[PDB]
Structure formats: C-alpha cells, structure tokens
Amino acid sequence: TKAIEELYVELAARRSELLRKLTETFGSWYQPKYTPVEHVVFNPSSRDHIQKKLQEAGWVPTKYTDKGAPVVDDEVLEGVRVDDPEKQAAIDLIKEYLMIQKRIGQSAEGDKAWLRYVAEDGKIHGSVNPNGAVTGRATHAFPNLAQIPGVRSPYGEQCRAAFGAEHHLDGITGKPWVQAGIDASGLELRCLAHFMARFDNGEYAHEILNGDIHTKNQIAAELPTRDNAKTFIYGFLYGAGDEKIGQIVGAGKERGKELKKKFLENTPAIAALRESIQQTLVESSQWVAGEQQVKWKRRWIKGLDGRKVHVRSPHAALNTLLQSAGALICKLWIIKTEEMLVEKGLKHGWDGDFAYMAWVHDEIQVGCRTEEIAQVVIETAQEAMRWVGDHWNFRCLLDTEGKMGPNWAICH
Amino acid sequence: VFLYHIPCDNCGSSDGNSLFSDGHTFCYVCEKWTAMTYNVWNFGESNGRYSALTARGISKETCQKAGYWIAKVDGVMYQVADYRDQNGNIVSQKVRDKDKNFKTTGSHKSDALFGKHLWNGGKKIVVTEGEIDMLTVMELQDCKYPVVSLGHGASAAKKTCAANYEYFDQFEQIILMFDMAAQVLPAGKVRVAVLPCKDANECHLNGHDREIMEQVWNAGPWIPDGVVSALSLRERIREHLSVGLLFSGCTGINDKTLGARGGEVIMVTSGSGMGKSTFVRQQALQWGTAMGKKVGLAMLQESVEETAEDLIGLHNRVRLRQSDSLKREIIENGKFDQWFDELFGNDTFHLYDSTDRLLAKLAYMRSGLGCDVIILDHISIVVDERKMIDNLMTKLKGFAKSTGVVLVVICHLKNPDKGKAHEEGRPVSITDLRGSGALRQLSDTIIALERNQQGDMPNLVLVRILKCRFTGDTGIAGYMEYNKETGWLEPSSYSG
Amino acid sequence: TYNVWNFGESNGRYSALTARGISKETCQKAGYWIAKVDGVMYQVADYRDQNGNIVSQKVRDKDKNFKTTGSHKSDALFGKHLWNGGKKIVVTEGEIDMLTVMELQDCKYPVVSLGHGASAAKKTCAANYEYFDQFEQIILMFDMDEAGRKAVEEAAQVLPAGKVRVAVLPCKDANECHLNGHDREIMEQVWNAGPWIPDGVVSALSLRERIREHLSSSVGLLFSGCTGINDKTLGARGGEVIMVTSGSGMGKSTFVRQQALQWGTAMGKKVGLAMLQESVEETAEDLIGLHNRVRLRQSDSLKREIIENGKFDQWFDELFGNDTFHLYDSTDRLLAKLAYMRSGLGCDVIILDHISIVVSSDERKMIDNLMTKLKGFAKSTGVVLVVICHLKNPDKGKAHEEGRPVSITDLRGSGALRQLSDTIIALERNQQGDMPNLVLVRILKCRFTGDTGIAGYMEYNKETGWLEPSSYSG
RNA sequence: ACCAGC
DNA sequence: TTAGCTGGTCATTTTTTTTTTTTT
Numbered sequence A: 001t002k003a004i005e006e007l008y009v010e011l012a013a014r015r016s017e018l019l020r021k022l023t024e025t026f027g028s029w030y031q032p033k034y035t036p037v038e039h040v041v042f043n044p045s046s047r048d049h050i051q052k053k054l055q056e057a058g059w060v061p062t063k064y065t066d067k068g069a070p071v072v073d074d075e076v077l078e079g080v081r082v083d084d085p086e087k088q089a090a091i092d093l094i095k096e097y098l099m100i101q102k103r104i105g106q107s108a109e110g111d112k113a114w115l116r117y118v119a120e121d122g123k124i125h126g127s128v129n130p131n132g133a134v135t136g137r138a139t140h141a142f143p144n145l146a147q148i149p150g151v152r153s154p155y156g157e158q159c160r161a162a163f164g165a166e167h168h169l170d171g172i173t174g175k176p177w178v179q180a181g182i183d184a185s186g187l188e189l190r191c192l193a194h195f196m197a198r199f200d201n202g203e204y205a206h207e208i209l210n211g212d213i214h215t216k217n218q219i220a221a222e223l224p225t226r227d228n229a230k231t232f233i234y235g236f237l238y239g240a241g242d243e244k245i246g247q248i249v250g251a252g253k254e255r256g257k258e259l260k261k262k263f264l265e266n267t268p269a270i271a272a273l274r275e276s277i278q279q280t281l282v283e284s285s286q287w288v289a290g291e292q293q294v295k296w297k298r299r300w301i302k303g304l305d306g307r308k309v310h311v312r313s314p315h316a317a318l319n320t321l322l323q324s325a326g327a328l329i330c331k332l333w334i335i336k337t338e339e340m341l342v343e344k345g346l347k348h349g350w351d352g353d354f355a356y357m358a359w360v361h362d363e364i365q366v367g368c369r370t371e372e373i374a375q376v377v378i379e380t381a382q383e384a385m386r387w388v389g390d391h392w393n394f395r396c397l398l399d400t401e402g403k404m405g406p407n408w409a410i411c412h
Numbered sequence B: 001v002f003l004y005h006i007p008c009d010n011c012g013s014s015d016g017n018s019l020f021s022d023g024h025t026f027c028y029v030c031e032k033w034t035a036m037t038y039n040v041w042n043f044g045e046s047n048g049r050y051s052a053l054t055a056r057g058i059s060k061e062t063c064q065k066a067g068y069w070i071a072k073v074d075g076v077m078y079q080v081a082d083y084r085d086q087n088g089n090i091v092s093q094k095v096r097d098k099d100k101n102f103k104t105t106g107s108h109k110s111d112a113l114f115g116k117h118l119w120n121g122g123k124k125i126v127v128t129e130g131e132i133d134m135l136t137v138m139e140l141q142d143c144k145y146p147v148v149s150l151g152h153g154a155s156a157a158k159k160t161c162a163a164n165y166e167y168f169d170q171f172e173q174i175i176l177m178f179d180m181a182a183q184v185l186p187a188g189k190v191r192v193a194v195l196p197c198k199d200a201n202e203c204h205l206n207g208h209d210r211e212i213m214e215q216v217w218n219a220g221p222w223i224p225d226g227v228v229s230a231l232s233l234r235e236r237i238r239e240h241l242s243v244g245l246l247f248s249g250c251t252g253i254n255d256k257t258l259g260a261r262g263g264e265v266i267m268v269t270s271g272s273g274m275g276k277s278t279f280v281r282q283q284a285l286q287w288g289t290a291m292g293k294k295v296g297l298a299m300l301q302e303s304v305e306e307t308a309e310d311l312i313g314l315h316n317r318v319r320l321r322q323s324d325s326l327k328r329e330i331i332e333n334g335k336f337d338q339w340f341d342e343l344f345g346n347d348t349f350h351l352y353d354s355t356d357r358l359l360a361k362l363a364y365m366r367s368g369l370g371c372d373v374i375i376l377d378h379i380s381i382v383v384d385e386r387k388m389i390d391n392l393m394t395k396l397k398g399f400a401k402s403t404g405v406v407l408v409v410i411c412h413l414k415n416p417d418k419g420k421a422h423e424e425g426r427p428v429s430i431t432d433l434r435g436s437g438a439l440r441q442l443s444d445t446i447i448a449l450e451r452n453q454q455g456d457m458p459n460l461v462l463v464r465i466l467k468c469r470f471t472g473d474t475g476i477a478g479y480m481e482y483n484k485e486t487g488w489l490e491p492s493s494y495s496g
Numbered sequence C: 001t002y003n004v005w006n007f008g009e010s011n012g013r014y015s016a017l018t019a020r021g022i023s024k025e026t027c028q029k030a031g032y033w034i035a036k037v038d039g040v041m042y043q044v045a046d047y048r049d050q051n052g053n054i055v056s057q058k059v060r061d062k063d064k065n066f067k068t069t070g071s072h073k074s075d076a077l078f079g080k081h082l083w084n085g086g087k088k089i090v091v092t093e094g095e096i097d098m099l100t101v102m103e104l105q106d107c108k109y110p111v112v113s114l115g116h117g118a119s120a121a122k123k124t125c126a127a128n129y130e131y132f133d134q135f136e137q138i139i140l141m142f143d144m145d146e147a148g149r150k151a152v153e154e155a156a157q158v159l160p161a162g163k164v165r166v167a168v169l170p171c172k173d174a175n176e177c178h179l180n181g182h183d184r185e186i187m188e189q190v191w192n193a194g195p196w197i198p199d200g201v202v203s204a205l206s207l208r209e210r211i212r213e214h215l216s217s218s219v220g221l222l223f224s225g226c227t228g229i230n231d232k233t234l235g236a237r238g239g240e241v242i243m244v245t246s247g248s249g250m251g252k253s254t255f256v257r258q259q260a261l262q263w264g265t266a267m268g269k270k271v272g273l274a275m276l277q278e279s280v281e282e283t284a285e286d287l288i289g290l291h292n293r294v295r296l297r298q299s300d301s302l303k304r305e306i307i308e309n310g311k312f313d314q315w316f317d318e319l320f321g322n323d324t325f326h327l328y329d330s331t332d333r334l335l336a337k338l339a340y341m342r343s344g345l346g347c348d349v350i351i352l353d354h355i356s357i358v359v360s361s362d363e364r365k366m367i368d369n370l371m372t373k374l375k376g377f378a379k380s381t382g383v384v385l386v387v388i389c390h391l392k393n394p395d396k397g398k399a400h401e402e403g404r405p406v407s408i409t410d411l412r413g414s415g416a417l418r419q420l421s422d423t424i425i426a427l428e429r430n431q432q433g434d435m436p437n438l439v440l441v442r443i444l445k446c447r448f449t450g451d452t453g454i455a456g457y458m459e460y461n462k463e464t465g466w467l468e469p470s471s472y473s474g
Numbered sequence D: 001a002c003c004a005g006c
Numbered sequence E: 001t002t003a004g005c006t007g008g009t010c011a012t013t014t015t016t017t018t019t020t021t022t023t024t
C-alpha cells in the first residue's frame, strides 16, 4: 500500500506541471455555442482539441482512417514536424501527459482501481472467470490483474515492484516469502508444429527444439528487438494484410509483401493446413461488395477433448484452431502441478507450504515459504509438463522455464 | 456502471457505443451522450455561466461538479456558490465579488458545508476553511476524493463542526487544513498537517503543490494544546542563553542584586515624601540617555512639562524649579534649545499624559514604540480596596510576563501605631506595604529608602533590599548623600 | 402543525412491517398507520387519552425527521388507553419495542410506551406517578446504550420503590433480538429480571476481591533533603494533595523544584510541572544548572563559556534523553489540560504553583469550587498533586519572614484550603537574623500518620543551590 | 476511438 | 477484401443570611 501511494503522490504533481506549462503555449480560443460564443481552453485529454491545434500549426496528416477526421495515436505524434520549434518539444509533453493520465486512471483514481480493492489483510482478491473467451481462454475482472504495464513501458518496474509476494510476513516466524514464476516459451508456435506435422513429415519441430526460435527468427528477419519479432511472427501467422505487418517495421507495403513471400516459401505447410481446414469447415462463400454471405457446413470444431469450439469468422479459423488447443494444455498443467505436490506430501494454503497467486494465459506465479520448496516446484513443473505432452500423445516436446525472486519484477 | 457495447447510430460503428445500468448510452467515436434578501437566485434568470477561473486556475468541470457559477446580472460579475442538503436540493447561496460583498441569500443554516451532497462513504476527508483551497484540492485530485469545507470560516468552528457529528462519524480519518482547533470530533481519529506556505492556493501558484499532496496522505497527529514535552527545548534554551541593567547611583546594590532581567518587577518605597520620585527620576535619567535603552515613564504626580523641566534641570546639575531668575536667564540668551537637543536627539524618553485604559496604552508603548523599561508612579489614584489592587498587580505581572520588559512601580507605606514614625528613622519591615498583602508576593525586587529629616544628617539616606529572588541577599546596601544644590545624590562611605 | 390528521383525508391504511418484523394485526390493534399525502408515504402514530379521545399525532417521514401536530402533553403515553389494570407491566423506550413485545406475547401483558424518549423521561415519569399506583410490578425496558443506562438510572427515581425491575438485552433493544432470532432469551428477561440494585450502593461482601487488589497495590515516594520528614509522612501515594507554604520568597519554589528533580533523575517518574511564576525557559535553565551543582542564571560568564566548548549538549542529553519531564506554557481549561497530562501522557506527579492568580466576584466560593474540583480530580485517579500557596498578613507581632513560627490558620483566601488538603508543610527561615541559610520544616496537618510539629533542619548552600540535611539542635 | 496484457 | 483474444475509459432599582482581607 505504501509503495503505490508513494508512486501516486509522485506522479500527481507531474500532470499539474504539464498543464500550467502547456496552456500558455497552446492558448485558449472562442468556440461558437447575437452569436453565442464561449471562452474554451486547451484540453489535452480530448483528441479533438489537439487535432484543431495541429491543423493551425502547419501540419498535414496524410492519413485518414475516418471519413472526415485524421487518426491521432502514438505513431502519428512521433513523425510530426511543425515550423515553431516550441511545439516540437510540446508534443512530447502532450504524449507524456496522456501516459500519466492513463497511469492515474489505472492506478488509484479509477472506479476499478488498485486501492479500492484492498482487503483488511493487505491483499487483493480478483475475479477469475475460467471460461470467458470463445476459445476457452480464462478472463480476469474486478480488478484485472493481467493487464498492468510491463517492464518495457515507462513507470513499469515501479508498478510491478508493488505487486510482490515478499510483502506477506509469515505468522509463526515473521519472515517474507519467495515468489517463483514459471512461463512456457513458444507455446502456440510449437502447437502449430504439432498440427501440421502430417504435411511436412514432422521436420519442422526439430528446429524449434534446436535453440531459441525467436532469436534466430530475429537474426534471419533483421528485426531490432526480440519483442518486435515475436509480434511480427504472430501477426503474419494469424492472417494479416499487406500493411499491418509493414507497420511493425515501419516501412511500406513492398517490404510487407517481400517478407510474406520470404516467410511463405520457407515452410510450405501453413497454406496446406489452411486449405485443409477450409475444405473441412466451409463449402461455399458468396461474395458481396459490402458484406459477405457464407453458407456453413460445420460451424463447430472438435478440440483436443471433444469440446465444440465455436467459430465466429471463416478467415479466423486458424486462430480458433490454434489458441483454443493451446489453453487446454496449460489448464491441465496447472492442475497436474498441484496434483503432484499434494501427493508428494506438501500443504497448500497460507498456513502451509505454497500458495497460488496469479495465473495469466502463459505463466504461473506461486509463493512459498523456503527456497527448497521453490526448487521442488521448479523441478516438478517440467515433469508435469512432460506428463501433459505424454498424456495426449503429442509429436512435439514441451518445455518451460522458471524464475526465482522476491517479487514480480524479476520473475516477469 | 458499464454493462456491454451496442452498435452506434450517429457514427454508425459496431462497438463504439456503450450501454449502462442507469439507462444512458455513450459512444466513444461520435462522442454522443443520451439518456435580508431571503430569495434563492434562479440559474437561468441571472445569466448563469460555467466559466473557468483564470487568475488562480480552476477547470470548468470542477465548477460544474461543485456548483460555483458566475452571474452577469446588472452589468457586474458575481461568483455564486451553492450549499445543498443530503436530499439534493439547493439550500442556500453565497455571493462574492471584487469588493467581497457578502450577500448570503436563502436559509443559511448554522451547520452549512460545501461538497457534502455527493459523498457519504469513504475513508479520508479533508476539511478546509475557504472555498478556493477546496476547489484547488479538487483540481489536484481530479474531483474524486471526499473533500468538504466550512461554510462559516475558522472563526466559528465551535458551532458548525459541533452540529455535524454523525456525518463525520461515518469515515475513518479526518484531516484538517485550517491554518498554516476544534476538539468536538472524536479523539484518535483527527490528523492535522502543516504546509510551508500560507494556504494551498500559494502552493498551487508557486509550484509547491507537491507539498500539498505529501501532507494529505502523510498528515501528522493532533497535539492538542501547549503541553510541551522536554524534547522540544533544544533551540529555545540556546536562544535564551544569548543581562542585568546596572543600578546607577550606588555600587553596593549591583553587588547583591545583579541588575534586572526581562520580565522583572521592581518596587520602590519609602515614607511620606522621602524622595521616591527624585531617586526613580535619577535612575531613569541615568538609564535612558546613557545606556541607549528606550524608557517609558508614567509619572502621575506632576504633569509632562514639569517632569521635563525636572529632567532638564537635573541633567545640567542645577535647580530649575527653585529660582525664577535662573528660569528667566536661560531663555534670554538662547541656551534653552541647547539643553533640549543634546538630550532629546535620540528620543529614548517617552512621557505619559493623564483603569483598564492604562494597560492598552502600556501595550501600545511596549509593542509599538519598542521600549525596555516602563516606570509607574503614584498607584493611589488607580486603586473595596483589596480586590482591585490584586487584580491590578495580577494584570501587570501578566503583562510583564513573556515580553522582556523591566517594570518599575512606586508605592507607599501605611501609618504606624506604636513607637517612632518612619520620618524619624524607623527600620521598615516587609509587611508595611499598604493596600494588600500580595504586593510583596508578585514583586521580584523590593527597594526601601530610609532617612531622618530631623536627626543629625537630613541628607543621608539608606537603601534596604527587602526581597530578591535572583540571589537571596537582603538588608542594608549602603549609604548615599543628597545634594541640596544640584539634586544629584552621590554614593558616600558612611559607617555605623 | 395544522390539525389531527384523519385517515380518510390522508389515505390511511394498516399494513405490516417487513423491514422490522411486525404483522398488520399489531399495528391494527395499536393505531400506528401510514398516510399518503404530498406523494411521500408518511408514518404516523396515534395518541389517546384515558377514555379514548384522540389527542395527539406523531408524524415521521422517510428520512428520520419529527413532526408534532400541536400541543404535545406531558402525560402522553403510547399504549395507555388499551390497558387499565394488571400485575406486571413493561415500559418500553421507543414505539417499535412495544409493538415487538405485543407481537411476541399475543396481546396478553399490559405493555405501554413513552412519549418523550430518553431526553425528557424524568418529567413524563414524574407526571405519571398516579397512573403507576394501580399496578403491582413494573419492568423497565430501555436501550443498551449509555443514554439508555442514564434513562433507566435517573428515570427510576420518581417511581414507587419495591416495584421496579430492570431487564438486560444483548442487542440494542428487543427488535433486533426479534430479528436475530433471540425470542427465547427475551422471555426469561420478561419473567425473571434484575432488581434496582446498581444505583451506586455496594454490598459488604462484593468488595472482597477489590480490597485485595488495593491490598496488592500505593507506595509512597521518598522525599529528599531531609530524612526527618519521611519519618512522619511515609511518602506520597495516589490521591494525595500536598500543600506547601511559607512566607513571601522564603524558598517554596526552590524546594519544590529540588523535590521534582530528585523524583525525576533518580526514580524515573513522569513529572508534570505547571509553573506559572516564570516561563518555560527560566525553569528549564534552573533545572539544568541545578543538576550540574552550579547557579546557571547567576553567572553570565559561565553561560558564555559553556556554549562555546559544546558541553551544553552533554548536559542536555543526560537530562532530557528519556523525556521524563513535561512542562506547561501559560480557568476551567487548566483542568482539561491537566486531565490530558495525566491520561494522555501518563504522568505520576502533578505540580502546580501560585494558586492566587488562578483565583484572581467573591473569591471564597471560587476557591472552594476550585479546591473541590481538584479534590475530585485527585480522587479516582491515583496521582500525587502538589499545590503551593502563600500566607496572609498577621495583625500584631513580628513578620512571618523574620523567623516567626507560623500557625495552620494563616493560609490566606479561605479556610477551605486546610479542610481538603492532606499534608500541609510550612517552611521557616530568618533572613535578617543570624543564619539566613538554616530552614525549619513544620508539619501542620497530616491525615495519614498524624505526627505534627518540627520535622528537622536543613542548611542552604549559596553556591551550588543544593540544601543539605544539617544537624542543628534548637 | 484510445491504452495495456498474452 | 480483413493479425486475433481479453479488460477499462467519460457522461448530466429593591431586602435580608455567611466569609475574608485591608483601614479609618
């Protein structure tokens, strides 16, 4: 509680400086209400006043998403140039003000904020819906503990340092505890190698087991960061266009075409699997110039446990075939990783040996009393993942990776 | 509260419009929202506009959520604030302008607050004394935390805060921002914080607003009254360590009295007409123009001009009021102003012209003019004759306390019954102070003059210390010889 | 305000109470009904006379406000008209309690209600004394609050003795115990309650543990400077007002300050001073100089010396390291500040000084009320209270400061000072005689030991300020 | 429409 | 002819009993 009130009192005196310094630059004006006028001032939170002030500052947007208005986001406020050099520095302050405003709205002043869901024992109880998505993915609400900013975002480490497991002293010794976080690396990309192994005869999952896939994908695709490469591969895989994956690298549609032609001719089994799924599900698709009329044949897909997975759109069938089969192995793994610990002779709960804290879509966060218990957990997680990979007769080899720490800033 | 999304109609989007439990919809794309005087002033009649304050800085949304609107009636500008109830109706109004014309219309209750018509549940609350600081805290906190303000000021906090008890009882912690004291609230709950400026508006307009928000969430305890612990005396004693005024006329007095201090009561007594005024006048003349201290006299026996003539004739070692030719000669040759200027160029002397009206004049002389030694004479006119003199001595002891002034008081003696009189050389006792018996209880130094006008030496006097708290040395100090030609009595070396 | 509201003109209707648990039969029997006027449904209670004449209405709204229809009488009781006799009545505090008791008893016992509440219950119970004479037992049923205990204590004084019995409840009153299902525990409180014992008198056998507790408590604080004083005083205990007097400027404040320093630096007792003769800085410098066996204010060169070599902090930390001392900064507010000094801080010794300014109309009634308030504050607190006073003018003879032996009837202002003070200690010395540094201690009054007279002799030191136990023989 | 997550 | 799956946002002057401490 104290570490987040210190952050709130830190970044509340920042946006009160970014409004006194900014309204003297971008002055007020009259707006038409005998003609009724009003003296309205510059509101940086509204996306309409900034558009009007960038019209009269000598800037052409050259991008029109709406039929009459340009788009205003983070990627158009970086490549913007005006004649007055004060506004060029003021746009960065506007972006910082919007970031601090979102930080305030998420952290403390929100209706579903952090400080309004703290119990008397200094803990947060969040609603975790096990089946909320259409692909069997669990959701989180009241509050949402799976959408806080990461370590790459500004004011990211100072927020994840407060959501720690070392803030719970033991009731018999008065000692903090140890947090272990275990993440799977390359889940859906290995499940894709499991599905299309009957087309390319299974020589695709061997390169994935041979070192890291995202690192050599970054090397072969000359992306600057690993995160941009991981974004680009799942953008290209789940049915992109010609510009939305050229937007990841920032270039035009020619680079977006040549990267698709490059990554398509490497492994010619994605299009064959897509054609097999389209031959399985749909039979006819009439085309409309403003809509689409599709006569369905089988709306549902049999999953890994016979569950009828629903399909919303026919060109997103690979999406609902991949991520719906990827959540069930994690859902069985989180069961088996405590079914082994209970049969081993441990005790679950705050008065015992370990306690589950957070389960986002990929990684788990467990908190335990001693480091030997964390060693037992990080040893048995690989055995549980191997039993998951062996129980449904997978052609691939599943693997995870765990981290040990005091809080949830190192173990991200 | 948010429920789900509906397709909009204005912008025509699919997931732009959102539906709520209250029945209203809101689109994120098209930005369309659906669904005395004794007279309360109408909003639309008096040209009500929600204009944002420019000279101090308050957004429009805070004025909309608080009800602080500007009227343009009669060609002038009024700032009407509204006080409401728990039901959600306008109870009273307050009108403020450039001349601060306090025109409080409507039924203004004795427990009127501001900002209580929206807030019933919570943990913290901030109470201020004005309205601009309250709106400033709403600006800093974006109008989402419970902050109220008094509707009558910090002068009548014993009535407004006392009448509202169950409203403040619903919360956990009450934080005050009055002055940078009301104990009607329950103890163990109220915190008081201190700002480095005058109020919150100065910290807002001078960039110290962070020091507002650091004091809200980390306010300090109550600390009721002037019960001072021993830890808070580190620098006050060191300042107090960094002085006795020397008694001129005799060196035997300062060997056992060590002068006078700040807040020191000196009492001067003798028989009927044995020369108290001459001795105190000599001490005043030797302390004023020879030591650089500002001395205020309150001689009530004579007038201002007569004691001025005394002082002038004394300092020039003559007898002015004892010869008409000496008074006539000094004005015919122009030497009168030479005695005036060299004595009154520094203006260390301040005389008084003639019972609670005296204490205000002494406070105006001490605080305003900045004097150090105040002298009072002839206490008999000022003062049942037991309660009045005790109340007078108590008020003068309270005035001399915590000020740093040397208070000299001239008193009298009572009539004896048996034995010899005081004019023949009787040794005076401590219990001869007439009027009361508390005059020797609050005085810190008591000096008595003894002489025999009918004996062998009618110009030999004796000084007797009767009470001394500082050292504890009382008795005969010495002997002094009076001059019948100059007035200046000199220290002698007479032996018994 | 206007008139008695008829149910026909106000759309009266008898219904049940879901939120409180009362069916429509009880409100039909009593006459507590609901009006539909001005949109908002108003609740209203009916009052009747002995014959049955409607005389008063009680109108309450949806937001807990009160509205009287006119002249509210003092003999107005809710439920008096229905019953005209019986052997056991139950008097309820509010109006829903009487309906709750009617619900849980099927309209059998004569149960009524008040018309004023807990604020003016004594007047309406004194004005209804003739109605309670025709009854045999009265069961008072009030709230489990401090105001309810005050009402059941003070309103049971104008009632006939031997017929008043008080029941207790675990809820606020009977209605939440009806809601929480405590319908069996309330009937035993109706049938078998407790009599009118806890008024304030005690039994001779109930003190047997508590007298033991006081037997296991109450040790006197030993004085310093003389061992002959403790031989006839045996210290100072809780609830002990000790009066100190002498002549004008004979050494009251010096002895009291030395006693305070010897209780502070040697016993660890938290001492609260209220010195009104001088301010905080002078007595602080006097304590600092007296602990170091010097005269601090009586040497300007020593004050200039000790501030340069930095040994002032060496004297400050050895005294105020534990914060055992708590000073006061300069009439009824002083009692509250001393109450906060005792309770909020936790001191054991409270010292005042120079009571004559505090009593500065008729001074005798003021000083008697002040001494009564200080005796009541010392009572049931367990604190030593030292009070310093002065003397009056003798008519004939020599002066008090010249070595005259002082009597007990020389305390000025009143005679009530010696009637409540426990131990009166007078100091005697002669500053104009032979030795002005030899003092005499005279015990004038002693309630506990009873040994009065000359205690001993002490010799004052003019250099160190430490008066020592001498061995002089008179 | 925007922000964050995986 | 389309990267997807979640959550969260702002809005209207009269008379008589008791006590004390100075002075004529």
Ligand SMILES: Cc1cn([C@H]2C[C@H](O)[C@@H](COP(=O)(O)OP(=O)(O)OP(=O)(O)O)O2)c(=O)[nH]c1=O
Binding pocket: A183, A184, A185, A186, A187, A188, A189, A230, A231, A234, A326, A361, A362, D006
């Ligand atoms: C970032 C991202 C991930 N995903 C999928 C990929 C994964 O199956 C899952 C989480 O992705 P990640 O955990 O970020 O990636 P990873 O597990 O393959 O690698 P590592 O643990 O070494 O960092 O969600 C999307 O579907 N869309 C996305 O935008």
Ligand SMILES: Cc1cn([C@H]2C[C@H](O)[C@@H](COP(=O)(O)OP(=O)(O)OP(=O)(O)O)O2)c(=O)[nH]c1=O
Binding pocket: B441, B468, B469, B470, B471, B472, B473, C246, C247, C248, C249, C250, C251, C252, C253, C254, C255, C277, C429, C436, C437, C438, C439, C460
């Ligand atoms: C007992 C005694 C005290 N003194 C000095 C030291 C004391 O500080 C000084 C008197 O100061 P206090 O002790 O303050 O005198 P007091 O309290 O009796 O009365 P008050 O303050 O109302 O006048 O007398 C002696 O010189 N010889 C002595 O024998």
Ligand SMILES: [Mg+2]
Binding pocket: A183, A184, A185, A186, A362, A363
């Ligand atoms: Mg991962």
Ligand SMILES: [Mg+2]
Binding pocket: C252, C253, C254, C277
């Ligand atoms: Mg004293």
Ligand SMILES: [Zn+2]
Binding pocket: B008, B009, B010, B011, B012, B013, B016, B017, B027, B028, B029, B030, B031, B032
């Ligand atoms: Zn819309």
